[PDB]
Amino acid sequence: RFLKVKNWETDVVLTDTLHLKSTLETGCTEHICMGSIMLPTKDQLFPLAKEFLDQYYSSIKRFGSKAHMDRLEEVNKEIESTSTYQLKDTELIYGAKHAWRNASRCVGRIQWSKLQVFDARDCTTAHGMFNYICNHVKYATNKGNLRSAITIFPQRTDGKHDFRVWNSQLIRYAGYKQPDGSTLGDPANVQFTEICIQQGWKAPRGRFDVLPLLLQANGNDPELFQIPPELVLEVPIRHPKFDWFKDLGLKWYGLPAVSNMLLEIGGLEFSACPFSGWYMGTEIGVRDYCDNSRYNILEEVAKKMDLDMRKTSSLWKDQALVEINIAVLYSFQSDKVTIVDHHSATESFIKHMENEYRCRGGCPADWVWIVPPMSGSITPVFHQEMLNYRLTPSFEYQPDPWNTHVW
Amino acid sequence: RFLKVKNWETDVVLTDTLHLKSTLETGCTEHICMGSIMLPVRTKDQLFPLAKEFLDQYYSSIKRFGSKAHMDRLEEVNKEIESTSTYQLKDTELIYGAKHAWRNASRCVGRIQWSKLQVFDARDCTTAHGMFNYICNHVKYATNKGNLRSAITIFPQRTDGKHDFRVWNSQLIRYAGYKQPDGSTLGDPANVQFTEICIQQGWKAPRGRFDVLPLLLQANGNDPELFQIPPELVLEVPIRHPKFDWFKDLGLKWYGLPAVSNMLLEIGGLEFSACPFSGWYMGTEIGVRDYCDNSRYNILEEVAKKMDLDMRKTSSLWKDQALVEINIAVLYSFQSDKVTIVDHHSATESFIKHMENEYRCRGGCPADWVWIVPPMSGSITPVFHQEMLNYRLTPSFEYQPDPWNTHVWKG
Ligand code: HEM
Ligand code: HEM
Ligand SMILES: Cc1cc(N)nc(CCc2cc(CCCN(C)C)cc(F)c2F)c1
Ligand SMILES: Cc1cc(N)nc(CCc2cc(CCCN(C)C)cc(F)c2F)c1
Ligand SMILES: C[C@H](O)[C@H](O)[C@H]1CNc2nc(N)[nH]c(=O)c2N1
Ligand SMILES: C[C@H](O)[C@H](O)[C@H]1CNc2nc(N)[nH]c(=O)c2N1
Ligand SMILES: [Zn+2]
């Protein structure tokens, strides 16, 4: 019940006391571990609010103080009255920073305290949402000196007036199924690209077309907006040794900005809460470029490298994979766009884990997600035992809006 | 109940019913997942249910469930338990049990081969010398001049826990490690503590970088005894690279036979504390872990130095680049010497086919994603994208404490 995690590369042992404060369920039981599964009223609300305010006033060292008890009473009064409540700006910032702090699948959490929170709870329309998102994108991009940010739209009320960004990420490339049978652009976005066209978009039908925003305010039908191209910082991908690499015609965008998750703070649900940081190189070079269900460029790159692709045991995929990821990192660094390699990021996370175990009693972590998708065991996180549990405030998945929208 | 797993690369969805036959714990609760934790004396009281369940599974598999043979065997095992406090497996049941322990090993990516396992019954063994002979015959048979064959040798089961058979080596073939006074390590740093034991037990150590450790063998709970595996039985492969002529001058080799010897085989409640088993290597076990773990031979720096990679900043991925070349070299060398090896692409693709086949014919395939995904190039192998359910079936291989931590020495 007071659990130990061992690093097998260093024999360092950490004692986890923080998991005792876990709340939500993992999907695992004593009989079955679901560690690798991707997606496992007034009465409920005040306990949730109390739990959150308790940790908030603890964190400002005012637990049990007059202002603590007064705030508890005031929120208790507001819930009994209005059946919901509103967060103080200070509680919103704390809650968002801690939702990131608690994201067990996120390797970049050493940065959790340096998050810019943009309060958009006064937003009422999709044009207003667009304005807030443009400002977010511009602030976060910062001419390539990327800065972590989240923009928080009004919280769910009766579930009929939900704010939603229909895009999975603020910036993503379109996908189109060809008549010739293959897929042009990003195959992961084929369905969303269709819903954009099915709603009015004029697709360039290119290979790297930045999708438009599909913004839903107050439960209304979503609306299309093109992000000003001058706000979308892209990096052409070249290799520091292979001159032919540029001819592949590859590029990626600088800003990873997740926009389809649900932020839960003190029982309140923020269905529209796009957040952004900066890329770890493998997200682009390993997953975006080399997944078979994505841009799937391994064969082409290996061909240009003249590797023996007859036998898998030549490890031509592995060689091509390394070179692609060298190019991504080289390209972003050359254009002075913030990026972190998986070696630096995972070393940071170990440092962060040691920091969290010391100053917080633990750090929930999902090994399946934390270990990078290449070169796993030469990064320190591979040898790090991790305890996965759900702390709140939290980011949660939610259904895709088109499956839900009472049209 | 029914459980679904999804492959996110292919959208294939499979339905697991086999998890309903799970018994042991995982370590996880509704409140905590212990999926990345490495490591999560038995009376007649619990033994006959464990026996009966195993015998039900056995007779079901041979399409004789409820037969007179099945009922007689239950009766015979029952009386043997209450009369003798244990029981003996028939040869057929031991073979079935050992194959199914492998089949049930959720951390093993090589399980497509589970039904082709050579079982050597060593339950008549009584002395460390007898153990040495059986293990030599295992090594010779499994090596097969490089055409490796899977095998397991099963020594007498535990009785009162005071007469255990144990192989003190973690693996039958492993290189020594020696901590130098200056703090550096000669040889395999993983084996330093075991090497010191062997030396203390009288092994004359050559003190090189690739010294095959002696076998340290404990029969019937007696003090363990040192034996040298005949060198002609130890197949080794010098490591060279197909393009880099300087790679051979690194002086690396490895042994061909991966033979785990420290695990416990549980069949029908019986505990076989000494059950060495062997198959063939997946290249990454050597090229990634053995050679490139910081706590092992740790050759990335020297390989990257010889490649003249940019080693000043990690973002050059000089480590990843050297890792691939080292793993090309291991695979090239084993193939060139005609020693069975499998690359991680082939192994993972076969495992997916095996897993799909198990879902169809068996209702599931327990699998530990954390261990199944290879330690390099994770997401370009099909297992990375495969959801997996981990649960414990018996028969099973289990960890047991290291024998030097528990042995009562005779002197
Ligand atoms: C600043 C640098 C950051 C880095 C390097 C980083 C890195 C990563 C990576 C590599 C993943 C794996 C996800 C995938 O492979 O698709 C991830 C997941 C995640 N990140 Fe971070 N991230 C950063 C910033 C942030 C911020 C600012 C937030 C929220 C405020 C956040 C919240 C999350 C969450 C919730 C997940 C998991 C979501 C899911 O399960 O799909 N991250 N991060
Ligand atoms: C024949 C080809 C085989 C291949 C390619 C193979 C491959 C592997 C690999 C790569 C691992 C993880 C090893 C590590 O990282 O330490 C593993 C684990 C395991 N293998 Fe297999 N194996 C094979 C045969 C066998 C056999 C014959 C048995 C038993 C009869 C077996 C039982 C196990 C068990 C019990 C584990 C769990 C290891 C643990 O928890 O420490 N394997 N296998
Ligand atoms: C802020 C930030 C920084 C950074 N470096 N990367 C990212 C992308 C990571 C990511 C991806 C997904 C998609 C999940 C579905 N996908 C598995 C198919 C959902 C997330 F909430 C998430 F954070 C974000
Ligand atoms: C038969 C076979 C084939 C193959 N290819 N490889 C292997 C080695 C795999 C392995 C290793 C370990 C020690 C784990 C050390 N770790 C816990 C720190 C224990 C095992 F039971 C096991 F099977 C075996
Ligand atoms: C902490 C973590 O569980 C540990 O490093 C595991 C990860 N996965 C592994 N996978 C394999 N095949 N072998 C290992 O030794 C490990 N080690
Ligand atoms: C099935 C498996 O859980 C799935 O492929 C996971 C594995 N680990 C991952 N890890 C990260 N960081 N991102 C991912 O999308 C995934 N996918
Ligand atoms: Zn679990």
Give the CATH number for residue A222. Answer: 3.90.440.10
> How distant, in Å, are the alpha carbons of A201, A213, A247, A287, A293 from that of A183?
19, 22, 20, 17, 10
What's the distance, CA B296 to chain centroid? 18
- A270 annotated to bind ligand: no
Residue of B nearest to A389 (CA): B32
- B109 annotated to bind ligand: no
Output the CA torsion sign for B76, B82, B83, B86.
Answer: positive
Q: Cβ contacts (< 8 Å) between B317 and chain A: which residues?
A: 322, 325-326, 329, 341, 343, 375
Instruction: Give the separation between CA B356 and CA B349, rounded to whole angstroms.
Output: 11
Q: Which residue's C-alpha comes closest to atom 15 of ligand 4? A: B170
Phi/psi for A394 (5° steps) reads: -150, 155
SS3 B272: strand
Instruction: Give the separation between CA B192 and CA B203, rounded to whole angstroms.
Output: 14
Q: Residue B24: inside a domain, yes or no?
A: yes
CB count within 10 Å of CB B184 equals 9
Chains A–B, number of C-beta pairs less than 8 Å apart: 208
Q: Cβ contacts (< 8 Å) between A298 and chain B: which residues?
A: 380
Nearest to B378 among A26, A34, A373 (CB): A373
C-alpha angle B278-B281-B286 in degrees, rounded to nearest 5: 125
A170: left (phi over 0), alpha (psi -120 to 50) or beta: alpha
Residue B376 near residue A374 (C-beta atoms within 8 A): yes
User: How much distance in Å is there from the Cα of A353 to the middle of ligand 2?
Assistant: 31
CB count within 10 Å of CB B228 equals 13
Does A22 share its domain with A61? yes
Amino acid at B174: R
Instruction: Give the separation between CA B23 and CA B54, rounded to whole angstroms.
Output: 12
DSSP structure class, residue B186: E
Nearest ligand 6 atom to alpha carbon B387: 1
Does A218 share its domain with A252? no
User: What is the maximum span of chain B, computed from C-alpha positions, in angstroms?
Assistant: 73
B288·A378 Cβ contact <8 A: yes
Nearest to A378 among B28, B292, B390 (CB): B292
Q: Residue A337: inside a domain, yes or no?
A: yes
Residue B379 near residue A283 (C-beta atoms within 8 A): no
Amino acid at B227: F
Nearest ligand 2 atom to alpha carbon B371: 12
Instruction: Give the separation between CA B154 and CA B94, rounded to whole angstroms.
Output: 9
Q: Which of A344, A360, A380 is the last residue of a domain?
A: A344
Does B114 share its domain with B144? no
Nearest to A389 among B31, B386, B387 (CB): B31
Residue A86 near residue A77 (C-beta atoms within 8 A): no
Helix axes A298-305, A316-334, angle to 10 degrees: 100
Does A215 share its domain with A153? no
Residue A159: Cβ-neighbour burial (10 angstroms; 0-12, 13-18, 19+): exposed
Verify whether ligand 5 is closer than 6 Å to residue B165 (CB atom).
no
Closest listed residue to residue B291, CA positions, set B170, B380, B190: B190
Residue B16 to chain A, least CA–CA distance (Å): 11
Residue B205: Cβ-neighbour burial (10 angstroms; 0-12, 13-18, 19+): middle
Phi/psi for B279 (5° steps) reads: -140, -125
What CATH number is attached to the domain comprising B87? 3.90.340.10
Helix (H) or strand (E) holding B346: helix B344-362
Residue A31 near residue B30 (C-beta atoms within 8 A): no
Closest listed residue to residue A102, CA positions, set A350, A360, A346: A360
Torsion of CA B336, A319, A365, A186, to 10 degrees: -130
Residue A10 to chain B, least CA–CA distance (Å): 8
CB count within 10 Å of CB A138 equals 17
Residue matched to tokens 């292919």: B10
- What is the spatial order of strands in the sheet that A268-270 belongs to? A268-270, A262-265, A394-396
Instruction: Give the separation between CA B218 and CA B232, rounded to whole angstroms.
Output: 24
CB count within 10 Å of CB B161 equals 12
- B291 annotated to bind ligand: no
Tokens of A231: 């706000």
Instruction: Give the separation between CA B212 and CA B226, rounded to whole angstroms.
Output: 13
Tokens of B204: 């004359």
Closest listed residue to residue B150, CA positions, set B184, B171, B174, B119: B119
B379·A291 Cβ contact <8 A: yes
Verify whether ligand 2 is closer than 6 Å to residue B277 (CB atom).
yes
Pocket of ligand 4 (CB under 6 A): B 38, 110, 170, 258, 260, 263, 277-279, 281-282, 285
Count up the domains in chain A and report the number: 3
Q: Cβ contacts (< 8 Å) between A371 and chain B: which residues?
A: 378
Where b means 16+ CB within 10 Å and e means fewer, B368-400 reads bbbbbbbbbbbbbbbbbbbbbbbbbbbbbbeeb
Does A36 share its domain with A153? yes
Residue A109 near residue A100 (C-beta atoms within 8 A): yes
Tokens of A77: 């009064």
Give the domain range for residue B197: 124-149+164-235+399-403
Q: Cβ contacts (< 8 Å) between B331 and chain A: which residues?
A: 313, 315
B33·A373 Cβ contact <8 A: no
**Residue numbers after which chain B breaks, C to N beyond 2.5 angstroms:** 40
Q: Which positions of B are annotated as active-site residues?
A: 108, 111, 280, 285
Residue A330 near residue B300 (C-beta atoms within 8 A): no
Tokens of A134: 């443009």
Tokens of A283: 């997200």
Where b means 16+ CB within 10 Å and e means fewer, B121-157 reads bbbebeebebbbebbbebbeebbeebebbbbbbbbbb
Tokens of A17: 């006391």
User: How much distance in Å is there from the Cα of B34 to the middle of ligand 7?
Assistant: 5
- B285 annotated to bind ligand: yes
Q: Residue B330: inside a domain, yes or no?
A: yes
Helix (H) or strand (E) holding B37: none
Tokens of A161: 């007036």
Rg of chain A taking only CA atoms, in angstroms: 22
DSSP structure class, residue B218: E
Residue matched to tokens 């060593």: B122
Instruction: Give the separation between CA B63 and CA B86, rounded to whole angstroms.
Output: 26
Residue A16 to chain B, least CA–CA distance (Å): 11
Pocket of ligand 6 (CB under 6 A): A 36, 38, 368-369; B 8, 384-387
Amino acid at A139: Y
Q: Which residue's C-alpha comes closest to atom 5 of ligand 1? A: A108
What CATH number is attached to the domain comprising A297? 3.90.1230.10
Does A319 share its domain with A301? yes
Residue A219 to chain B, least CA–CA distance (Å): 30
Nearest to B34 among A286, A315, A387 (CB): A387
Residue B188 near residue B198 (C-beta atoms within 8 A): no
Residue A144: partners with Cβ closer than 8 Å, 6 or more residues away = A233, A254, A335, A336, A337, A338
B390·A33 Cβ contact <8 A: yes
Q: Residue B339: inside a domain, yes or no?
A: yes
Name residue A384's beta-bridge partners. Answer: A7
Q: Cβ contacts (< 8 Å) between B35 and chain A: which residues?
A: 28, 33, 35-36, 367-368, 388
Residue matched to tokens 């329309």: A125
DSSP structure class, residue B80: H
Nearest ligand 2 atom to alpha carbon B148: 1
DSSP structure class, residue B155: P
Closest listed residue to residue A107, CA positions, set A248, A269, A227, A278: A278
Does A169 share its domain with A183? yes
Helix axes B44-61, B68-84, angle to 10 degrees: 160
Name residue B186's beta-bridge partners. Answer: B178
Peptide bond into B395 cis (omega under 30): yes
What's the distance, CA B353 to chain centroid? 21
Instruction: Give the separation between CA B262 and CA B138, rounded to whole angstroms.
Output: 15
Closest ligand, as measured to the CA of A98: 1
Does A202 share its domain with A179? yes
Cited resolution, angstroms: 1.9
Q: Which positions of A are annotated as active-site residues?
A: 106, 109, 278, 283
User: How much distance in Å is there from the Cα of B156 to the middle of ligand 7?
Assistant: 34
Please give the span between the terminal C-alpha atoms of chain A, in angstroms, as a whole number. Answer: 48
- B194 annotated to bind ligand: no
SS3 B146: helix
Does A272 share its domain with A152? yes
Residue of A nearest to B314 (CA): A343
DSSP structure class, residue B314: G
DSSP structure class, residue B249: G
Q: Cβ contacts (< 8 Å) between A321 and chain B: which residues?
A: 377, 380
Q: Residue B248: inside a domain, yes or no?
A: yes
What's the distance, CA A399 to chain centroid? 16
Does A354 share its domain with A322? no
User: How much distance in Å is there from the Cα of B83 to the middle of ligand 5?
Assistant: 43
Torsion of CA A341, A141, A112, A283, to 10 degrees: -30
Instruction: Give the separation between CA B377 and CA A70, rounded to whole angstroms.
Output: 55
Residue A243: Cβ-neighbour burial (10 angstroms; 0-12, 13-18, 19+): exposed
Please give the span between the terminal C-alpha atoms of chain B, in angstroms, as a whole number. Answer: 55
Specify the experimental method: X-ray
Phi/psi for B129 (5° steps) reads: -65, -40
Instruction: Give the separation between CA B144 and CA A383, rounded to whole angstroms.
Output: 34
Please state the three-class secondary structure of chain A as a single string. CCEEEEECCCCCEEEECHHHHCCCCCCCCCCCECCCCCCCCHHHHHHHHHHHHHHHHHHCCCCCCHHHHHHHHHHHHHHHHHCCCCCCHHHHHHHHHHHHHCCCCCCCHHHCCCCEEEECCCCCCHHHHHHHHHHHHHHHHHHHCCCCEEEECCCCCCCCCCCEECCCECCCECEEECCCCCEEECHHHHHHHHHHHCCCCCCCCCCCCECCEEEECCCCCCEEECCCHHHCCEEECCCCCCHHHHHHCCEEECCCEECCCEEEECCEEECCCCEECCEEHHHHHHHHHHCCCCCCCHHHHHHHHCCCCCCHHHCHHHHHHHHHHHHHHHHHHHCCCCEECHHHHHHHHHHHHHHHHHHHCCCCCCHHHHCCCCCHHHCHHHHECCCECCCCCEEECCCCHHHCCCC
Q: Cβ contacts (< 8 Å) between A372 and chain B: which residues?
A: 378
Does A33 share its domain with A153? yes
SS3 B291: helix
Closest listed residue to residue A209, CA positions, set A146, A254, A274, A253: A253
A315·B328 Cβ contact <8 A: yes
Length of chain A: 407
Beta strands in B246-400 (DSSP E): 253-255, 259-260, 264-267, 270-272, 277-278, 281-282, 341-342, 396-398
Nearest to B9 among A34, A293, A326 (CB): A293
Nearest to B28 among A28, A326, A378 (CB): A28
User: How much distance in Å is there from the Cα of B394 to the middle of ligand 7?
Assistant: 19
Closest listed residue to residue A195, CA positions, set A179, A211, A182, A219: A211
C-alpha angle B327-B263-B187 in degrees, rounded to nearest 5: 45
B31·A9 Cβ contact <8 A: no
Q: Residue B295: inside a domain, yes or no?
A: yes
Does A183 share its domain with A249? no
CB count within 10 Å of CB B242 equals 16
Q: Residue B408: inside a domain, yes or no?
A: no
Residue A157 near residue A45 (C-beta atoms within 8 A): no
Residue A349: partners with Cβ closer than 8 Å, 6 or more residues away = A107, A108, A109, A110, A365, A370, A381
Q: Residue B26: inside a domain, yes or no?
A: yes
Phi/psi for A126 (5° steps) reads: -70, -30
Helix axes A66-82, A42-59, angle to 10 degrees: 160
Residue A203 near residue A193 (C-beta atoms within 8 A): yes
User: How much distance in Å is there from the Cα of B366 to the middle of ligand 6?
Assistant: 18
List the single best residue of B317, B338, B351, B389 to mutate versus A (max A Cβ within 10 A). B317
Instruction: Give the separation between CA B277 and CA B142, rounded to whole angstroms.
Output: 9
Residue A379 near residue A372 (C-beta atoms within 8 A): yes
